[PDB]
Amino acid sequence: XXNXXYX
Amino acid sequence: XXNXXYX
Ligand SMILES: *[C@@H]1O[C@H](CO)[C@@H](O)[C@H](O)[C@H]1O
Ligand SMILES: *[C@@H]1O[C@H](CO)[C@@H](O)[C@H](O)[C@H]1O
Ligand SMILES: *[C@H]1C[C@](C)(N)C(O)(O)[C@H](C)O1
Ligand SMILES: *[C@H]1C[C@](C)(N)C(O)(O)[C@H](C)O1
Numbered sequence: 001x002x003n004x005x006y007x
Numbered sequence: 008x009x010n011x012x013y014x
Binding site: 004005006 | 010
């Protein structure tokens with residue numbers, strides 16, 4: 001991954 | 008806020 005969120 | 012990221 002490497003991005004974040006939260007969805 | 009309350010959401011995340013990262014931008
Ligand atoms: C999500 O990423 C942030 C940034 O590194 C960190 O501070 C949180 O503990 C992690 O859940
Ligand atoms: C989200 O990320 C910030 C930055 O590291 C941190 O301060 C919060 O505790 C984490 O939930
Ligand atoms: C991350 C934060 C958020 C977008 N407010 C959420 O609580 O809805 C999600 C489930 O986790
Ligand atoms: C959160 C993750 C990311 C989008 N890959 C970033 O490193 O570019 C940003 C600065 O922090």
